[model samples]
Target: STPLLTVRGSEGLYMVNGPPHFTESTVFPRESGKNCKVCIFSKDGTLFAWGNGEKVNIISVTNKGLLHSFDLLKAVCLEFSPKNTVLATWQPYTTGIPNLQLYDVKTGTCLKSFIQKKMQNWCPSWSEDETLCARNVNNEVHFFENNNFNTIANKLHLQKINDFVLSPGPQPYKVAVYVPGSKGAPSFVRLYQYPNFAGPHAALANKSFFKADKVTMLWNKKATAVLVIASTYGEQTLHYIATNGESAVVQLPKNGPIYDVVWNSSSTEFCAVYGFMPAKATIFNLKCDPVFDFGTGPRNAAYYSPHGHILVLAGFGNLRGQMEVWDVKNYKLISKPVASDSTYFAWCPDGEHILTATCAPRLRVNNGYKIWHYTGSILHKYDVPSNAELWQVSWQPFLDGIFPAKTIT
Candidate 1:
């Protein structure tokens, strides 16, 4: 089995196969006095880029060797393109104006430089296939295609463009833009099809209007429709915006104010939480219909299993841990277990077990991870070094059949 890769903040990175035991440790190259640490893996998790302010190292995760390094200015923010062939680095404040630079990761070459007064200190988003889009502080978006940063395909300057989402597949791509209402105007959601094809509806494919002060857009896996959450001072509203230009609106009944909302894996349903000290969980289908409601409690975490068949609601109550597992398809609580104080918990890829861990480090306690079956029975508890501080934990997807480990000299 493959081990979980853990990052101990600025200390170093470790690969652990079991509790308090690790096979490898890579101490990060540090520069004293400056908080020089930012690392992110590519979309495929095969390549990772880590750097402080002055230098960056792009390394193969499996081979565990540095493939390339770039000597550049300290990056305020950096991100890898969708395919992991390019890197975008942003620098701001120190140079007076913000700067965006693109690098070809394979060749260690600086491909392009973009300097603008309104370029925000933010990272650009890459589409799944070839396109990349970046938003400027001046309410404009620049789009590039074919992985060539030198040429921009189109630029859209819209008013109060809060955020945008690029569809998953190839062009004739779908892009959804959210514009929150301001100055007593109604908010608008706009959709566009890329490359235009020189067609009649090339300029604006679809659009909808709303009366939201803030908005969050969620797109389904197929990108056929988007669920928009419009939040006002007094109420919360949900809207379904279809690519075919059809729209529907629904207002969430008064069940306290929604603090967080997340869609399940299939995007067929979503979960929303109301309040925190004592939270209430509400489930709804994509059509804005209520499905199931988990009664109120002092809950902090709520998530669905990978297969979307199970829902786990866990929290701290009475100075102890409490977890409730539900079978969404059958609509019943399967188990209610008294667990430890877990700062974080997630479903395993198999969807039959759960992984729980403490987020904060303590002096004498054995802070580690525990695996539990859906019935709330403990399977294993892997202990960690008492001195180790955990930032986060994630389970890597299982590999298919047999494979050889790749190593680089």
Candidate 2:
């Protein structure tokens, strides 16, 4: 009764959770449950991993398939560095609360542990240059340098920082910060120049915040404007902020809490998730306004596909979970929705593969919690602790990349 299955696609193949509904609902012989969550991938599509709850099990994804495992103290958050030299993780805190640790991807050695106790550190984003780790511990923000894990700046904005993002669109290296309340300046939004050296720079003291709900910022890959979510949870309001060194806001429809906000592969368009439900994205013609809106969400949705043209929505109905892909161009749902039992979090760098994380949602469940990966339908599983929850996942950029590339030509 070892849970495993293979998902055949147009490309190499995506390892997926069981497709129970596919077998009972459709004609495909569905692969049963392999409890998993949070799949991490290397850029070149060689290294892949799925955490079951305690440790992150890895393997060579090049089809050579050399399997390895690492014992993470309390594996929660995992992200590969741009160079693939280090994999970052946030372990559960006990004696002194939780902190983040950077591990050597090859040897699986702990390199750096950042963010002392007393703060909730979770989401981590590496700089395009892979020089800094922009992370959020609770409402405040901190930037850590990879060279020595040195603090670039602690508490970039002291008053509970929200929407702390490093712009990845046309003009990379730019950073935008904002808040959601409609109070004084604290509830407004601001944009600052993303400094590389930081020696001869002026602090973003005079910038203003926006009058929105839960403010979050995003840089559209295909346009010059930054996508903004003014209100989250209460009222779903979408706004687009321009990056001309000036703060510009464009209003959007009031919906739900904006959950997933991502830019299309080309950066020309952007997609978003409101609350737990997914909505069709309203596309902008690289200008502003007059955007396109299509598609819809069945449950927990993910647009982790590498093609940047499709959005995937996957989740379970109590005992069973499922996934579906939607074509952004036609505003139509493509590829029948696939079902599963594991709660998936991250997709592989190659887009052809993905991983899913599981939880012991029931406090009374004696089996405890676990994590699993389903690449090409072959299910790989692992067991994790009860308290540890894998919140997010990111692809390593440097491995199989042009990092530190010597330009002879």
Candidate 3:
């Protein structure tokens, strides 16, 4: 599964200067710095944070935009529960070993925390039920169930599990992880079921598949099946594979690689964005299941708004520094808001407001980045910069139902 954005820069980290052109008038209060990092946002678009020594800032629009800050070094890796009830921040930097902290979004207090022995934990995703985390620590997707803080599964053998996604509440307790192999075997995307992260898991393979492309798993509309949107040798061909422990391929047409693809909460419609001129977005509806024939061009990174059925498509060149949102069903652009250069966006999982990153850089000087917010017609800006260049913008929906600024730490 590709990320919502692939940010690159001279600083070795992703940085944004909110739509480079939008800076013509509004003056920003920030100091120049070298910022390079990745961040994740909360569902309500209220809280944002990142790991790798980035910065964290919380902007609570609902409460007069109350601001909050936490040491970025505390996060090992972060992921919010689907229900947005809790956020799991792994490996607090203060501790030398493996540790995890579960925080309540409203109180900003640690609910449960623990440490494990020699457990090399990394990708920790919440289960569909939100009661436990499906973590890949020791060559296995360990389940910490019933809030028990214990290893639930060590039976599976996975080399390096890249990323996984959960199904809707009504769907099965399942996940998909990428497992690479030695020479001659290439690599494959694996899908496993809960209670037994063991055998019988599905492997997504295609004859045309050249090499392993980082995979991002997404469940189909009914959760009956899952799809893998991966590249072939890092090329633009996005091979859509359906897993039922069986192999099937659905290749989408495009001249560039797929950056991100997301389903409307209902899973009925899904959109894919590519990295090329005119920035194309393909909106595919499951009902008419045929080819990957759907939403295209003029936009990339399509998101379903939490406020309503609004679909937000973020493109750079056309609007220069502005991001555009459109009505998915009708394909009508809603708002054309100015953003930072390389300005990518994330919808607060709850679908209310959005938080974006902006930056400013010139030849032979340190570039800078900051966070911005938008709700209805109101736009607010925050003067937040990092030690490294900011690479990408990921909104945190786990905090206070509002979007905040989070840079790579």
Candidate 4:
């Protein structure tokens, strides 16, 4: 039985699977497993972890077998490594205790523990294929090759480096570092290919600016370009830089410091959902030029299906839960559905259906999850029992990619 959705609610943990027929299977019955603290599936979605506010149970989602139990002390969160070989968990900081730990999923061995005292910057970075891993400590990025964290294989150090991020694609990984400007100086961001920082001139690209209180850097899907959002709140703008040293300020038509932005699977274009009352969303190409304008709407978020054929512009949260699903290839609005009161939404891995739920934790009234085909038809609805509260609902992980989009390369 394939796992279609894994749900965590106040009552227990449940798995919903539907191919020809839909059914919900209780992982831990309500009597024994009420009020799960956290629940997460592996990166590949074959394994799952459930926390019942005390210890966490690691189970094979596919085989329905309990694999391991971890005394994570009501872990604040759980994460699975890229290959699903390691499970990392964290709990509230307690001054002297090591609150973060990594466990070997196969052997159930406690691999290592660290004193991660804050949740703001809690996780380490890993290459997409798990070939390399790194974490920051005192202006340096300590790297371990081939998942061997026992000893460092390489390192990147920059004096006064405040933050760094690893690029997400193939090998010879690139790293971006942010250094804050001080005294009378201007802050700067630099991009470099791993092991290639021979000197100050070895950077693949560089950009410097002022007025940034903090920064967020995003790498395009192809790992070719990076977008930096620097802020002073009163001062806000977007910068785009590519590996080849090309950089530009995205001249958005309006005062957009407005809302969200997401890249397409193709990595060639992106959609920006910005401005409001009735916000504007547009698709922009690599040149930071507009390709299509979604005009104005009660929308603040954009969702591209697993493949690149469709897009959904939505207005949830502060606005009505209205969705305008579009055909990306032709820039046509295919469906307009009003999913009022939904607190969470996810596109199924297959990209054929989407799940929208009014998680009771977010609100006790009208607690239920609804499934809708992209073309505006209501497909299925899971009504929550009056006694239970649904917390979150999510699909399986990186599948075998039986429905993969066209590769960029």
Candidate 5:
């Protein structure tokens, strides 16, 4: 059976196949599993780790077998390498002290360790190919190449920085870091190029300074362009900065700061919302042409489907939550806003159905999850038992062919 959903009950972990109505539950072994609080699945969903104060156990999600276990004082953080070979865990101490340990997933052996004092609480960002890792300490970022786990490049900034992000693709990687302006200096977004992680060399690609209170940066899916949204005294400006140093700016109304922005899978266009009373949203193409404008509504949250065919916009109108579904390719509102008590909804891996979880405070006693189609048709409702509180719900990331399926009943 396909593991359609995974739920964390009050005691143990449960896997649901196909639908919540399947009624059968496959409970994994939790022997000496103290909080089993952190459960993470590999990108392909073939492997998973259940970590707690005791030790972290790596398991085969499909085979339902224990692969390996790492004995740690306390597993505070866990992340599987992009290539799925190494697991990185971190133990943080008070006063900005952190220790990082990387273990081989197959042998459960320690590969390397990194310890730093007075560092931020963020984990090292890994490249898509898993060949390089970048960890930011204070106003600097240290690049570590894979072979010897050695530092290849260390970048230090002059001004205080707000946030930094990495874009994944082939050679000549792109890194975007945002810095808030100081007294006489203006805020800016700086782009850098890491030619290769095997050596300690980097060159400045581009930089754009802005006169604003703060700026937010986002990279297009292809990493060919970076979207910078700047807010100053309630007015907003959206800038599309291409890799070649060409840029276009779109002046936005001062109704409110840009509510949210997301890129489509192809990186050709994006959807954004502005304002609060009745927010106005637009879908803009690469050249800054408006594809569609989803006219005003309440505070909203928008997400583009992985397949790039649909966009789900959710918000609250009355006392209940409302959601609107849009057909991206045709720029049509296929479904109007539907009101329900469900506060969270996510698209299925196939991008066909949507799974919604309720946020009722009395969920344990009388709340449930619902499923719907992009056309706004309610398909099914799965009720949670009165004995268990609904904490979280998620669908399996992979489909049937990539990994074997198991039956619980």
Candidate 6:
């Protein structure tokens, strides 16, 4: 099977497939000022969609055909419902204007529009089956049944709620709500079954800690846990609540800064890349106990493969973009490649290829994205056109575990 990479920029669109099969198909040339607004892959990567400020193009990536073309002024964000049933688009919100609209994928007919006035949480949450949907409106979670965008079937309201996230799995989806600590009240993050916020007892899990200036909540893959990196100032505190109400904090061992905490696909363990300049990465289990200590390196971020086995520890931003690839299952070294000047990193869903791109606006001087074989070899080199910039490159989505993991010699 050939793997496809979607490449886009200020004025570029390409489909690359040539043994990593590394080749190229140019959809949009570097004809500057086209200013392609945004692009997204469908949940299964079968379809591709993008906007050019006012016009939208939805293409079937798998069958290589045009799926839909819509004209909506200044659309910036695009999303697809589960299995590509519906396509969603967003434009800058004007007062009383419905800036968000959903379209039927096959018919390209407008399904509905809503007055979504902000970029934050612009897209509503939906189940993998698209049966249920919910959106955050004015700090409250409103549920919509069966794509019935007109009527709110139910609402979950909490006093002074700040933000919330809907868990993705099945019908009985959980929602994690965060209410900031106000006027000396400790901030709290709690989870509850949908439509079950009757009392404190109904809250499945709750964790409260001292006030922080802002909050960033992360949900693991399984939707079984949430990590709250309550950010204040010089330090970031880590805390979490598993679905059982067994809430606890990760007593970070170092004093520097926590650059990134990533969950392996299995959801049983995560790697925290923290500490000063020559940072450290340690994988911890469900109990918050260190499973493997990857002592100091010039690393600031950790990324796990789609299948949860390979972990890539990278130190970009003047650490010269060095990387340490490790096999999480065996805790063994795979490669240490010095892929310099890259401003972005992503692993192919196929689990064998990786792409590091030096994108525009990030640097713009020397712009390109290189494809890498996990064993530390450059498979293909793509350089941006002179004076232009490479903005994005992403692998098309595909089912996980489709290609068995193998050591690429």
Model 1, 98-214: lDDT tens digits are: 477778888888877776443443666677765565444456667776676667678766676777887665555777888765776777877777645245665443445656667
**lDDT (tens digit, per residue) of candidate 6 on 1-409:** 7567877875466677734557665432334225676888887888888878878988887676777778655678998987688888898876566899888898988888988888887888886767778888877788887888889988887766778877766667788988875687888998988777786599999999888776777777788898888775157788878988889999778888788888887889988888777787899888988999988898878888888789999988767898899988788889999779989998888787888999878787778888887789998988877968888888877766586776534
Regions of candidate 4 where Cα sits further than 4 Å from its true position: 1-3, 26-32, 232-235, 404-409
Which rank order by TM-score, best down to worst?
6, 4, 5, 1, 3, 2
Q: How far is candidate 6 from the true structure (C-alpha RMSD, Å)?
A: 2.3
User: Model-by-model lDDT, in order?
Assistant: 0.64, 0.50, 0.49, 0.78, 0.66, 0.81
Estimate TM-scores for all models. Answer: 0.75, 0.59, 0.61, 0.91, 0.81, 0.94
Better of 2 and 5 by TM-score: 5
- Model 2 weakest lDDT span, ten residues long: 21-30
> Which residue pairs does candidate 6 place in steric collision?
17-21, 17-23, 18-21, 18-22, 18-23, 19-22
Per-residue lDDT of 1-409 in model 3, one digit per residue for the tens?
A: 0112213233442222232223321111122113424345454443444444454333332242324445543564666665656666665434364366666666676666665443343435666566656655555556666545544643446665545555545444666666555556656665555655534434332222445545556776456455566555135444444443445554455576676677665556666676555656666655324323334545555666643366666665334554566655455555666554544455544344565554443212223333333323543344333554434444323322243333212
**How well does candidate 3 score on lDDT at residue 21?**
27
Could you arrange the candidates by lDDT from highest to lowest? 6, 4, 5, 1, 2, 3
Winner by TM-score between candidate 6 and candidate 4? 6
lDDT of 5 by residue, 93-117 (tens): 5554346777888888877777744
Task: Give per-residue lDDT, candidate 1, residue 358.
Answer: 65
Off by over 4 Å in 1: 1-3, 18-36, 71-73, 96-98, 115-121, 132-137, 169-171, 196-213, 232-235, 275-278, 314-323, 332-389, 392-409
Candidate with the larger TM-score of 1 and 5: 5
- For 1-409, candidate 2 gives per-residue lDDT tens digits of 1112333211212343332311211211222113344456654445665555666765664444445567544555566676567777665667664377777777877776766443343536776557666766666566766545554553465466655777653333556666544455436555555554234343332235446545556665433456666553346455556655444443445355554566666766665554435443444544545355554555544563555545565654352455665556555665543444454445444344445544334222222112222222433343434444333323332222232222111
Give the poorly placed runs of model 6, Cα more than 4 Å off.
26-34, 407-409
Highest-scoring model, lDDT: 6
Residue-wise lDDT of candidate 4 within 1-409, one digit each (tens)?
Answer: 3336877776566777743355765543444356777888887778888787689888886676789977745687888888887888888787477787788999999777777777766667778888887777676787878768788887777667778888876887998888885677888888998878778688999888784876878887689888887875134667787898988877778774546677787889988776535777889899999999988988877888878778999988877899999988877788899889888878776666788889865778778888788888887787778887888888776554565543221
Off by over 4 Å in 5: 1-3, 19-34, 71-73, 94-98, 115-121, 153-161, 181-184, 196-216, 230-237, 316-319, 337-343, 359-368, 383-387, 398-409
